[PDB]
Short mmCIF file of C-alpha atoms and ligand atoms in Angstrom, two decimals:
data_model
loop_
_atom_site.label_atom_id
_atom_site.label_comp_id
_atom_site.label_asym_id
_atom_site.label_seq_id
_atom_site.Cartn_x
_atom_site.Cartn_y
_atom_site.Cartn_z
CA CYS A 1 -57.65 -24.13 41.19
CA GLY A 2 -53.88 -23.88 40.85
CA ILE A 3 -52.17 -22.00 38.07
CA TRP A 4 -48.59 -22.36 36.98
CA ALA A 5 -46.85 -20.81 33.97
CA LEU A 6 -43.40 -20.30 32.49
CA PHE A 7 -42.18 -17.93 29.78
CA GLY A 8 -38.63 -18.09 28.43
CA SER A 9 -37.77 -21.39 30.14
CA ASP A 10 -34.63 -23.43 29.37
CA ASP A 11 -36.61 -26.74 29.36
CA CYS A 12 -40.37 -26.71 30.13
CA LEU A 13 -41.26 -30.19 28.95
CA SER A 14 -39.24 -32.86 30.82
CA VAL A 15 -38.03 -31.38 34.13
CA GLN A 16 -40.84 -28.79 34.55
CA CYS A 17 -43.85 -31.00 33.79
CA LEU A 18 -42.79 -32.14 37.30
CA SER A 19 -42.75 -28.62 38.86
CA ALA A 20 -46.38 -27.97 37.76
CA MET A 21 -47.47 -30.73 40.22
CA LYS A 22 -46.45 -28.89 43.43
CA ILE A 23 -49.81 -27.07 43.57
CA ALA A 24 -52.08 -30.08 42.71
CA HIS A 25 -53.92 -29.83 46.04
CA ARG A 26 -55.75 -26.67 44.90
CA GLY A 27 -57.47 -28.42 41.94
CA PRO A 28 -58.09 -32.16 42.43
CA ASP A 29 -60.57 -32.82 39.59
CA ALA A 30 -58.22 -32.57 36.57
CA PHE A 31 -54.77 -31.44 35.39
CA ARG A 32 -53.60 -30.09 32.00
CA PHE A 33 -50.04 -29.14 30.99
CA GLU A 34 -49.22 -27.65 27.60
CA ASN A 35 -46.69 -25.47 25.77
CA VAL A 36 -47.27 -22.76 23.16
CA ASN A 37 -47.03 -23.20 19.37
CA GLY A 38 -44.17 -20.98 18.16
CA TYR A 39 -42.98 -20.34 21.77
CA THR A 40 -42.31 -23.88 22.91
CA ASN A 41 -40.26 -22.70 25.93
CA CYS A 42 -43.47 -21.10 27.33
CA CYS A 43 -45.98 -23.38 29.08
CA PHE A 44 -48.99 -23.66 31.34
CA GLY A 45 -49.97 -26.13 34.09
CA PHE A 46 -53.49 -26.02 35.48
CA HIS A 47 -55.03 -28.02 38.31
CA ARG A 48 -58.78 -27.68 38.22
CA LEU A 49 -61.40 -27.71 40.94
CA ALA A 50 -64.46 -27.66 38.64
CA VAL A 51 -66.92 -25.16 40.17
CA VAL A 52 -68.74 -23.74 37.08
CA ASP A 53 -69.09 -25.74 33.82
CA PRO A 54 -67.64 -29.18 34.50
CA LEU A 55 -67.74 -30.34 30.85
CA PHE A 56 -66.29 -27.40 28.88
CA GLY A 57 -64.28 -25.29 31.37
CA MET A 58 -60.85 -26.96 31.40
CA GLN A 59 -57.92 -24.48 31.08
CA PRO A 60 -55.83 -23.04 29.46
CA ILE A 61 -59.03 -21.50 28.09
CA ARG A 62 -58.63 -21.27 24.32
CA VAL A 63 -61.65 -20.50 22.11
CA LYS A 64 -62.14 -20.51 18.32
CA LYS A 65 -62.91 -16.77 18.13
CA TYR A 66 -59.52 -15.76 19.56
CA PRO A 67 -56.97 -18.25 18.27
CA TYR A 68 -54.00 -16.40 19.74
CA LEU A 69 -55.26 -15.91 23.34
CA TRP A 70 -54.42 -18.36 26.14
CA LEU A 71 -55.99 -17.73 29.58
CA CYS A 72 -55.25 -19.46 32.85
CA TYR A 73 -57.03 -18.20 35.99
CA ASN A 74 -58.02 -19.12 39.51
CA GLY A 75 -61.20 -17.25 40.36
CA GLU A 76 -64.85 -16.43 39.98
CA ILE A 77 -66.18 -13.57 37.80
CA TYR A 78 -69.62 -13.18 39.39
CA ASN A 79 -70.87 -10.55 36.87
CA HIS A 80 -69.80 -12.49 33.78
CA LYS A 81 -73.33 -13.30 32.59
CA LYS A 82 -74.68 -9.75 32.63
CA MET A 83 -71.64 -8.53 30.69
CA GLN A 84 -72.06 -11.41 28.21
CA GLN A 85 -75.71 -10.39 27.66
CA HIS A 86 -75.15 -6.64 27.49
CA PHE A 87 -72.32 -6.92 24.96
CA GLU A 88 -73.94 -9.94 23.18
CA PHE A 89 -70.79 -12.06 23.28
CA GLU A 90 -71.11 -15.62 22.04
CA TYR A 91 -69.33 -18.08 24.39
CA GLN A 92 -67.81 -21.37 23.36
CA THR A 93 -67.64 -22.71 26.93
CA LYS A 94 -69.98 -22.18 29.86
CA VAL A 95 -67.25 -20.97 32.24
CA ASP A 96 -67.33 -17.52 33.88
CA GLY A 97 -63.70 -16.69 33.01
CA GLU A 98 -64.32 -16.80 29.23
CA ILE A 99 -65.65 -13.21 29.66
CA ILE A 100 -62.03 -12.09 30.19
CA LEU A 101 -61.18 -13.12 26.60
CA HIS A 102 -64.13 -11.27 25.01
CA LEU A 103 -63.51 -8.09 26.99
CA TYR A 104 -59.77 -8.16 26.33
CA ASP A 105 -60.21 -8.63 22.60
CA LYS A 106 -62.66 -5.69 22.59
CA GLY A 107 -60.84 -3.16 24.85
CA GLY A 108 -57.43 -4.27 26.09
CA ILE A 109 -56.24 -5.29 29.53
CA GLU A 110 -56.88 -2.18 31.64
CA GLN A 111 -60.49 -1.78 30.43
CA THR A 112 -61.06 -5.54 31.12
CA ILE A 113 -59.67 -5.98 34.62
CA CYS A 114 -61.51 -2.93 36.02
CA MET A 115 -64.86 -4.54 34.92
CA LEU A 116 -64.50 -7.86 36.77
CA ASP A 117 -66.81 -8.21 39.80
CA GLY A 118 -65.14 -11.13 41.50
CA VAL A 119 -61.96 -12.74 42.76
CA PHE A 120 -59.12 -13.87 40.50
CA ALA A 121 -55.48 -14.43 39.79
CA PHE A 122 -54.71 -14.77 36.09
CA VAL A 123 -52.11 -15.08 33.37
CA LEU A 124 -53.16 -14.11 29.81
CA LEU A 125 -50.92 -14.71 26.77
CA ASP A 126 -51.57 -12.94 23.44
CA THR A 127 -49.27 -14.20 20.68
CA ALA A 128 -50.67 -11.80 18.02
CA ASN A 129 -49.82 -8.66 20.04
CA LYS A 130 -46.83 -10.30 21.78
CA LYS A 131 -47.97 -9.64 25.34
CA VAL A 132 -48.23 -11.50 28.63
CA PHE A 133 -50.56 -10.09 31.31
CA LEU A 134 -50.70 -10.88 35.02
CA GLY A 135 -53.62 -9.71 37.19
CA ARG A 136 -54.93 -10.05 40.73
CA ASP A 137 -58.23 -9.01 42.33
CA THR A 138 -58.58 -5.89 44.47
CA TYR A 139 -58.23 -7.44 47.95
CA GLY A 140 -55.91 -10.24 46.87
CA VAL A 141 -58.39 -13.00 47.65
CA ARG A 142 -57.03 -15.38 45.01
CA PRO A 143 -53.21 -15.71 45.18
CA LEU A 144 -50.36 -15.19 42.74
CA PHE A 145 -46.58 -15.24 43.10
CA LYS A 146 -43.92 -14.47 40.52
CA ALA A 147 -40.21 -14.84 39.81
CA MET A 148 -38.31 -13.10 37.08
CA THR A 149 -34.68 -13.06 35.97
CA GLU A 150 -32.55 -10.50 34.17
CA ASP A 151 -32.47 -12.65 30.99
CA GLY A 152 -36.33 -12.54 30.81
CA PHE A 153 -37.40 -15.87 32.36
CA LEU A 154 -40.81 -15.39 34.05
CA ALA A 155 -42.48 -18.02 36.29
CA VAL A 156 -45.84 -17.55 37.99
CA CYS A 157 -47.86 -19.69 40.36
CA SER A 158 -50.83 -19.62 42.76
CA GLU A 159 -48.48 -20.50 45.65
CA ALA A 160 -44.75 -19.78 46.15
CA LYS A 161 -44.18 -23.52 46.74
CA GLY A 162 -44.60 -24.09 42.97
CA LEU A 163 -41.72 -21.70 42.20
CA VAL A 164 -39.00 -22.32 44.82
CA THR A 165 -37.68 -25.61 43.27
CA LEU A 166 -37.37 -24.19 39.71
CA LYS A 167 -33.75 -24.25 38.42
CA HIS A 168 -32.99 -21.60 35.78
CA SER A 169 -29.57 -21.73 34.04
CA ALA A 170 -27.23 -18.93 35.18
CA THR A 171 -29.25 -17.83 38.22
CA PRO A 172 -28.03 -19.29 41.52
CA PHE A 173 -31.14 -17.90 43.33
CA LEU A 174 -34.58 -17.24 41.84
CA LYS A 175 -36.25 -14.41 43.75
CA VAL A 176 -39.91 -15.20 44.43
CA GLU A 177 -42.40 -12.50 45.43
CA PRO A 178 -46.15 -12.02 45.94
CA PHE A 179 -47.88 -10.38 43.03
CA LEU A 180 -49.60 -7.30 44.49
CA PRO A 181 -53.40 -7.27 44.88
CA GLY A 182 -55.31 -4.83 42.73
CA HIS A 183 -52.55 -4.65 40.10
CA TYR A 184 -52.03 -5.82 36.53
CA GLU A 185 -48.66 -6.23 34.79
CA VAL A 186 -47.93 -5.96 31.07
CA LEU A 187 -44.93 -7.77 29.64
CA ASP A 188 -43.55 -7.93 26.14
CA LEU A 189 -43.11 -11.38 24.61
CA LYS A 190 -39.81 -11.56 22.73
CA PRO A 191 -39.27 -13.73 19.60
CA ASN A 192 -37.31 -16.36 21.58
CA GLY A 193 -39.99 -16.69 24.32
CA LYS A 194 -38.33 -14.45 26.94
CA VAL A 195 -40.34 -11.56 28.36
CA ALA A 196 -39.57 -8.04 29.55
CA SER A 197 -41.77 -6.08 31.89
CA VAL A 198 -43.38 -2.94 30.44
CA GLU A 199 -45.53 -1.71 33.37
CA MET A 200 -46.90 -2.73 36.73
CA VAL A 201 -50.18 -0.80 37.25
CA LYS A 202 -52.59 -0.18 40.12
CA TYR A 203 -56.17 -0.40 38.83
CA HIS A 204 -59.55 0.73 40.24
CA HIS A 205 -63.04 -0.52 39.42
CA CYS A 206 -64.89 0.88 36.38
CA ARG A 207 -68.50 0.35 35.14
CA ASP A 208 -69.29 -3.22 33.96
CA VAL A 209 -72.49 -2.15 32.12
CA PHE A 210 -73.43 16.04 56.22
CA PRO A 211 -75.58 15.65 53.10
CA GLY A 212 -77.51 12.30 53.02
CA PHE A 213 -76.33 9.09 54.79
CA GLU A 214 -79.51 8.94 56.93
CA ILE A 215 -79.33 5.85 59.17
CA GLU A 216 -82.45 4.10 57.79
CA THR A 217 -81.11 4.60 54.25
CA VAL A 218 -77.61 3.33 55.21
CA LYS A 219 -79.03 0.23 56.96
CA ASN A 220 -81.35 -0.53 54.06
CA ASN A 221 -78.55 -0.24 51.46
CA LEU A 222 -76.21 -2.41 53.57
CA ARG A 223 -78.86 -5.14 53.79
CA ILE A 224 -79.50 -5.05 50.05
CA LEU A 225 -75.77 -4.93 49.11
CA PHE A 226 -74.91 -7.78 51.51
CA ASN A 227 -77.76 -9.91 50.21
CA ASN A 228 -76.60 -9.20 46.64
CA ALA A 229 -73.02 -10.10 47.63
CA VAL A 230 -74.13 -13.51 48.90
CA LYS A 231 -76.61 -14.04 45.99
CA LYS A 232 -74.05 -13.40 43.22
CA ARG A 233 -71.77 -15.88 45.05
CA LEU A 234 -74.31 -18.71 44.53
CA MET A 235 -72.74 -19.12 40.99
CA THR A 236 -71.61 -22.77 40.96
CA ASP A 237 -72.70 -26.24 39.83
CA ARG A 238 -71.19 -27.71 43.05
CA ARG A 239 -72.40 -27.94 46.64
CA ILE A 240 -72.09 -24.80 48.79
CA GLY A 241 -71.27 -25.03 52.49
CA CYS A 242 -70.28 -22.56 55.17
CA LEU A 243 -67.93 -22.10 58.07
CA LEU A 244 -69.91 -21.15 61.16
CA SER A 245 -67.96 -20.29 64.32
CA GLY A 246 -70.80 -18.54 66.21
CA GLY A 247 -69.12 -15.11 65.93
CA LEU A 248 -71.21 -12.33 64.48
CA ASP A 249 -69.63 -12.30 61.00
CA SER A 250 -69.77 -15.99 60.16
CA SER A 251 -73.33 -16.03 61.61
CA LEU A 252 -74.58 -13.23 59.38
CA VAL A 253 -72.94 -15.00 56.41
CA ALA A 254 -74.47 -18.40 57.24
CA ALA A 255 -77.93 -16.98 57.84
CA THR A 256 -77.98 -14.80 54.74
CA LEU A 257 -76.60 -17.71 52.68
CA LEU A 258 -79.37 -20.14 53.77
CA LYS A 259 -82.01 -17.51 53.02
CA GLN A 260 -80.50 -16.98 49.54
CA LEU A 261 -80.25 -20.78 48.87
CA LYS A 262 -83.96 -21.07 49.72
CA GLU A 263 -84.92 -18.17 47.45
CA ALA A 264 -82.97 -19.96 44.66
CA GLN A 265 -84.84 -23.27 45.41
CA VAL A 266 -81.67 -25.14 46.15
CA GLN A 267 -82.57 -28.69 47.18
CA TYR A 268 -79.65 -29.73 49.39
CA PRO A 269 -79.37 -28.83 53.07
CA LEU A 270 -76.72 -26.19 53.83
CA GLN A 271 -73.89 -27.91 55.66
CA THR A 272 -72.21 -25.66 58.31
CA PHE A 273 -68.93 -26.44 60.05
CA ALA A 274 -67.48 -25.33 63.38
CA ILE A 275 -64.27 -26.42 65.05
CA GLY A 276 -62.97 -25.88 68.61
CA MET A 277 -61.85 -27.56 71.85
CA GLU A 278 -64.94 -29.18 73.44
CA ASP A 279 -67.30 -27.19 75.69
CA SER A 280 -66.09 -23.96 74.01
CA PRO A 281 -68.39 -20.95 74.33
CA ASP A 282 -67.81 -20.37 70.58
CA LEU A 283 -68.99 -23.91 69.70
CA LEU A 284 -72.24 -23.41 71.69
CA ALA A 285 -72.71 -20.11 69.86
CA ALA A 286 -72.22 -21.88 66.50
CA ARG A 287 -74.74 -24.62 67.44
CA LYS A 288 -77.24 -21.95 68.51
CA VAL A 289 -77.04 -20.23 65.11
CA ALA A 290 -77.27 -23.54 63.23
CA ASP A 291 -80.49 -24.48 65.04
CA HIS A 292 -81.92 -20.98 64.46
CA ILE A 293 -81.28 -21.01 60.68
CA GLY A 294 -81.84 -24.78 60.31
CA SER A 295 -78.51 -25.92 58.85
CA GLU A 296 -77.04 -29.42 58.82
CA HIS A 297 -74.33 -28.67 61.37
CA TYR A 298 -71.00 -30.45 61.96
CA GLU A 299 -69.13 -29.78 65.16
CA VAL A 300 -65.49 -30.88 64.97
CA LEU A 301 -63.42 -31.21 68.13
CA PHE A 302 -59.68 -30.63 67.75
CA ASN A 303 -57.12 -32.17 70.08
CA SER A 304 -54.08 -30.25 71.43
CA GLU A 305 -51.81 -33.05 70.13
CA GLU A 306 -53.48 -33.08 66.68
CA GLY A 307 -53.07 -29.25 66.48
CA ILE A 308 -49.38 -29.30 67.42
CA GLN A 309 -48.89 -32.24 65.05
CA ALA A 310 -50.40 -30.18 62.18
CA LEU A 311 -48.10 -27.12 62.61
CA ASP A 312 -45.47 -28.40 60.21
CA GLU A 313 -47.80 -28.99 57.24
CA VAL A 314 -49.88 -25.87 58.12
CA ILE A 315 -46.83 -23.60 57.87
CA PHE A 316 -45.86 -25.42 54.66
CA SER A 317 -49.33 -24.59 53.26
CA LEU A 318 -49.29 -20.96 54.45
CA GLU A 319 -45.77 -19.95 53.36
CA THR A 320 -45.62 -17.46 56.18
CA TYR A 321 -44.54 -17.17 59.78
CA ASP A 322 -46.84 -14.41 61.24
CA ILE A 323 -47.95 -15.53 64.73
CA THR A 324 -51.60 -14.43 64.53
CA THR A 325 -51.94 -16.11 61.10
CA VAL A 326 -50.24 -19.42 62.11
CA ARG A 327 -52.30 -19.72 65.36
CA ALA A 328 -55.67 -19.39 63.60
CA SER A 329 -54.64 -21.46 60.55
CA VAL A 330 -54.40 -24.74 62.45
CA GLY A 331 -58.16 -24.90 63.12
CA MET A 332 -59.09 -23.71 59.61
CA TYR A 333 -56.78 -26.34 58.02
CA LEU A 334 -58.23 -29.11 60.14
CA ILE A 335 -61.87 -28.13 59.53
CA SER A 336 -61.07 -27.98 55.79
CA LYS A 337 -59.57 -31.48 55.96
CA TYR A 338 -62.77 -32.70 57.66
CA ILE A 339 -64.99 -31.02 55.10
CA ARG A 340 -63.15 -32.62 52.17
CA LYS A 341 -62.99 -36.03 53.89
CA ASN A 342 -66.57 -36.27 55.11
CA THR A 343 -68.87 -34.24 52.81
CA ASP A 344 -69.28 -33.07 49.23
CA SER A 345 -69.38 -29.36 50.18
CA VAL A 346 -66.81 -27.66 47.93
CA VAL A 347 -67.71 -23.93 47.76
CA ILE A 348 -67.15 -22.73 51.37
CA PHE A 349 -68.45 -19.32 52.56
CA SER A 350 -66.51 -17.58 55.34
CA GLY A 351 -66.53 -14.22 57.19
CA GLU A 352 -63.02 -12.80 56.50
CA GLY A 353 -62.77 -9.09 55.75
CA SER A 354 -65.53 -7.92 58.14
CA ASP A 355 -63.28 -6.85 61.03
CA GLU A 356 -60.99 -4.88 58.75
CA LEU A 357 -63.85 -3.27 56.90
CA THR A 358 -65.98 -2.44 59.97
CA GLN A 359 -63.16 -1.61 62.45
CA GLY A 360 -64.15 -4.60 64.55
CA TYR A 361 -60.85 -5.34 66.28
CA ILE A 362 -60.78 -4.32 69.98
CA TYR A 363 -57.82 -1.95 69.53
CA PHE A 364 -59.99 0.36 67.36
CA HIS A 365 -61.56 1.47 70.69
CA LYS A 366 -58.24 3.39 71.25
CA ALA A 367 -58.05 5.32 67.92
CA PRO A 368 -56.98 9.05 68.02
CA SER A 369 -59.79 10.09 65.57
CA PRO A 370 -62.32 8.80 62.98
CA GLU A 371 -59.74 9.67 60.23
CA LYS A 372 -56.90 7.75 61.97
CA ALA A 373 -59.32 4.81 62.46
CA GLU A 374 -60.48 4.99 58.81
CA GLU A 375 -56.80 5.04 57.71
CA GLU A 376 -56.00 1.99 59.84
CA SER A 377 -58.98 0.16 58.23
CA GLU A 378 -57.42 0.98 54.83
CA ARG A 379 -53.99 -0.43 55.82
CA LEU A 380 -55.64 -3.61 57.23
CA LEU A 381 -57.58 -4.16 53.94
CA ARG A 382 -54.42 -3.55 51.83
CA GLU A 383 -52.56 -6.13 53.96
CA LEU A 384 -55.20 -8.88 54.12
CA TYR A 385 -53.38 -10.88 51.44
CA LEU A 386 -50.47 -11.39 53.85
CA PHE A 387 -52.65 -12.31 56.84
CA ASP A 388 -56.30 -13.36 57.24
CA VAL A 389 -56.96 -13.81 53.49
CA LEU A 390 -53.69 -15.73 53.09
CA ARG A 391 -54.90 -18.07 55.87
CA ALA A 392 -58.41 -18.37 54.41
CA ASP A 393 -57.13 -19.23 50.95
CA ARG A 394 -54.19 -21.44 51.75
CA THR A 395 -55.91 -23.64 54.33
CA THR A 396 -59.08 -24.29 52.30
CA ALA A 397 -57.23 -24.71 49.01
CA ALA A 398 -54.87 -27.20 50.73
CA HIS A 399 -57.85 -29.62 50.70
CA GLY A 400 -59.38 -28.87 47.31
CA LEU A 401 -62.07 -26.44 48.56
CA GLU A 402 -63.01 -23.02 47.14
CA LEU A 403 -63.25 -20.04 49.54
CA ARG A 404 -65.92 -17.32 49.09
CA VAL A 405 -65.85 -14.14 51.22
CA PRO A 406 -68.87 -11.85 50.80
CA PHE A 407 -67.69 -9.09 53.15
CA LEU A 408 -65.07 -8.28 50.53
CA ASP A 409 -67.71 -7.82 47.82
CA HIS A 410 -66.78 -4.84 45.69
CA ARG A 411 -70.15 -2.98 45.85
CA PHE A 412 -70.80 -3.82 49.56
CA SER A 413 -67.25 -2.89 50.71
CA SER A 414 -67.10 0.30 48.55
CA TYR A 415 -70.44 1.48 49.99
CA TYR A 416 -69.37 0.80 53.56
CA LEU A 417 -66.06 2.66 52.97
CA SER A 418 -67.94 5.64 51.48
CA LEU A 419 -69.84 6.19 54.79
CA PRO A 420 -69.03 9.24 56.93
CA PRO A 421 -66.17 8.05 59.23
CA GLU A 422 -68.23 8.99 62.28
CA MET A 423 -71.04 6.57 61.46
CA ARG A 424 -68.40 3.82 61.39
CA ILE A 425 -66.65 4.45 64.76
CA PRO A 426 -68.22 2.78 67.85
CA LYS A 427 -70.48 5.46 69.42
CA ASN A 428 -72.48 3.17 71.81
CA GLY A 429 -69.39 1.34 73.17
CA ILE A 430 -69.72 -1.85 71.06
CA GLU A 431 -67.72 -2.68 67.90
CA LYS A 432 -69.64 -3.02 64.62
CA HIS A 433 -72.73 -1.38 66.00
CA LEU A 434 -73.95 -0.24 62.57
CA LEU A 435 -73.49 -3.75 61.18
CA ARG A 436 -75.53 -5.14 64.11
CA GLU A 437 -78.32 -2.55 63.71
CA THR A 438 -78.44 -3.26 60.00
CA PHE A 439 -79.62 -6.81 60.72
CA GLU A 440 -81.62 -6.36 64.00
CA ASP A 441 -85.10 -6.28 62.37
CA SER A 442 -84.40 -9.39 60.26
CA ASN A 443 -84.71 -12.09 62.96
CA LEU A 444 -81.74 -13.37 60.96
CA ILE A 445 -79.77 -14.67 63.92
CA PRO A 446 -80.64 -14.89 67.69
CA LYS A 447 -80.51 -11.47 69.41
CA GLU A 448 -77.99 -12.81 71.95
CA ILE A 449 -75.49 -13.55 69.13
CA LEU A 450 -76.28 -10.28 67.27
CA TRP A 451 -75.26 -8.26 70.36
CA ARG A 452 -72.35 -10.46 71.72
CA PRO A 453 -68.86 -8.75 71.86
CA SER A 454 -56.53 -22.17 75.90
CA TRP A 455 -55.22 -23.32 72.48
CA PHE A 456 -52.95 -20.23 72.74
CA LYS A 457 -51.66 -21.47 76.15
CA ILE A 458 -51.05 -25.01 74.81
CA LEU A 459 -48.87 -23.57 72.00
CA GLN A 460 -46.86 -21.48 74.55
CA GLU A 461 -46.06 -24.52 76.67
CA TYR A 462 -45.06 -26.57 73.62
CA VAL A 463 -42.67 -23.93 72.08
CA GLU A 464 -41.23 -23.29 75.59
CA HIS A 465 -39.78 -26.84 75.42
CA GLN A 466 -38.65 -26.49 71.77
CA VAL A 467 -36.79 -23.13 71.86
CA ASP A 468 -34.17 -22.72 74.63
CA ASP A 469 -33.02 -19.36 76.04
CA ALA A 470 -29.72 -19.36 74.09
CA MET A 471 -31.59 -19.82 70.80
CA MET A 472 -33.67 -16.68 71.71
CA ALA A 473 -30.60 -14.65 72.74
CA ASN A 474 -29.01 -15.61 69.41
CA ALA A 475 -32.20 -14.82 67.38
CA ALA A 476 -31.02 -11.56 65.78
CA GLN A 477 -27.92 -13.42 64.49
CA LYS A 478 -29.80 -16.47 63.17
CA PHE A 479 -32.78 -14.52 61.78
CA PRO A 480 -31.67 -10.92 60.98
CA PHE A 481 -34.76 -10.22 58.80
CA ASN A 482 -38.01 -9.86 60.81
CA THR A 483 -36.30 -11.23 63.89
CA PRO A 484 -38.67 -13.23 66.14
CA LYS A 485 -39.42 -11.70 69.58
CA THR A 486 -40.96 -14.75 71.32
CA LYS A 487 -40.24 -18.41 71.45
CA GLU A 488 -43.59 -18.93 69.67
CA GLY A 489 -42.39 -16.58 66.91
CA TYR A 490 -38.99 -18.30 66.79
CA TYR A 491 -40.52 -21.78 66.48
CA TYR A 492 -42.84 -20.79 63.56
CA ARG A 493 -39.87 -19.13 61.86
CA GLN A 494 -37.75 -22.31 62.13
CA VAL A 495 -40.53 -24.41 60.60
CA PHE A 496 -40.92 -21.80 57.86
CA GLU A 497 -37.15 -21.66 57.19
CA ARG A 498 -36.91 -25.45 56.98
CA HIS A 499 -39.49 -25.41 54.11
CA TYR A 500 -38.54 -22.08 52.58
CA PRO A 501 -34.96 -21.27 53.63
CA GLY A 502 -34.07 -17.65 52.91
CA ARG A 503 -37.66 -16.69 51.89
CA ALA A 504 -38.62 -14.62 54.95
CA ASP A 505 -39.22 -11.44 52.89
CA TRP A 506 -42.56 -12.90 51.59
CA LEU A 507 -43.73 -11.24 54.81
CA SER A 508 -42.75 -7.57 54.99
CA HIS A 509 -43.77 -7.02 58.67
C1 ONL B 1 -60.73 -23.36 40.63
C2 ONL B 1 -61.23 -22.07 40.04
O1 ONL B 1 -60.59 -21.04 40.08
C3 ONL B 1 -62.55 -22.11 39.31
C4 ONL B 1 -62.39 -21.54 37.89
C5 ONL B 1 -63.75 -21.45 37.22
N1 ONL B 1 -64.66 -20.51 37.94
C6 ONL B 1 -64.32 -22.83 37.19
O2 ONL B 1 -63.83 -23.68 36.42
O3 ONL B 1 -65.24 -23.08 37.97
CL1 CL B 2 -65.54 -14.41 46.89
#
């Protein structure tokens, strides 16, 4: 789903009905645009991918009980039903996000956002109390960007590409920035439709309704929490599929997912999707897992020429120029295209978050202590929204698919992060050893995969021809912010700057 909203606009009917369409790709099933009674220079645009409640879930969500609340969100509130039941709320729709309205009316914004077990970016307008609220989930899984002017014009969107062509009177340049994960903002609505920020607030989770850490207890809890993470993510009336690369993380996801689909008596085969250059070791690993779990497996072969040819639109989708991110996004974009083209799988499970959470990257083998390693894991998790989780969202949403990432489950990730730092560093000499031991009695995946530790070259050779030595020598002059250090870096930056000239500070690093 793609959200777009303006408060305090000059003209949000004629010229900005057209700006709401820039993020259509995220939500192919339906579009609604509307303005606000009494505040007709404030408006919403919503592109829906209908995942829960096809008939009654169109947004802005507006229900009879709360005539002055307007909610637009991209997300999934996995614990909505148990809150609904505990508090005995009566829904008008059947959509998970309606819980946000009932909780807000009861307790305000802070006490609402801390209760949501899920992923989300939202905008909530309350015309009785004269407030606008922005919010984003803890790890930043679902995206949000914002722009605000001194006169009190506010514009928000799922992707920066829906903000950069807005023209506000008396601002020659509209500054666009990511909205920070794990924050809410409160803004005052003024009588003429402009807004003024009150506070931007970091929130933590609340309730919705050495001593210990023995290894058998830790492994048992991790199994249960991971299973729960996947189970709560079966919430959808659409077909669930799964990316399956043959790596440990996607394999554990695929295998646990199929087991949970069976327990729920789901009647469709699980479709799994791998992509690579043919005769890859990774593709054979993926096929091995597929046969072990019994999925309906699609193996997609990408061509060097196809990959290079996709860079332009991939960087357009991503809105960043980080080398690691751009490299990996080409394959994810192309597999997502294939999924949308060839199947009806819409809710796509993936393994992002695991490496950051479990200290799985090779360089963690060189960490000065368990506390310096633990700290680095915390920085990686805080920055996911710029990197791996940016890639995972932008490249699936580019083709009208919905990403789900169970490693970033709130209860599972919190429990793992609570573990003594010394149970989490590699003691045997293999990364993610605890994670592997957790699942070794399950027969969940083949033991060979459970214990396993030139697209890159083709990109080098291509950018070598596109960036000459003088361009590189001149790089600090042409690109003074986050200057590129390689020709690969330089090339991605040029593509980025052609789409988003002057926007390089979306990436801090
Ligand atoms: C596209 C999206 O965020 C889904 C919103 C809600 N869960 C739904 O309509 O399925
Ligand atoms: Cl998720």
